[PDB]
Design a protein around this ligand. Sequence first.
Ligand code: HEM
Length: 106
Amino acid sequence: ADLEDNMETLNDNLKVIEKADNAAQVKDALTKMRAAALDAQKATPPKLEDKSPDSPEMKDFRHGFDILVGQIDDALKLANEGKVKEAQAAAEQLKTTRNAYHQKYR
Ligand code: HEM
């Protein structure tokens, strides 16, 4: 990963969800989100670079990727069923973990 490109891509996919009037495009974008989260989980966050080497939190800063990717799977389960709307609604919930959790770790 770099990190920059994975973070912007997680954002870009959320932007696609604000437009995509069909479960097709909502899902195709959200797929790229999952890929970017997977690679971001393989990156080192500067907010916690000076951390302890083996800090049990840093090691598990991953918790946000686990929580976020969890909610991405649930959101994908909406549009994949055809609830493209409810996917777009719950996309606002993904924004807490990019806003709140960003304060901790960003
Ligand atoms: C929908 C979920 C998320 C979105 C869309 C998002 C988006 C972004 C964006 C745009 C940036 C910085 C781009 C820039 O200023 O050039 C960023 C940076 C960052 N994010 Fe997120 N983020 C998300 C979730 C998360 C989560 C959950 C974590 C931690 C588990 C995290 C950790 C970070 C870190 C460390 C950076 C700073 C790296 C840098 O300066 O580029 N993000 N994110």
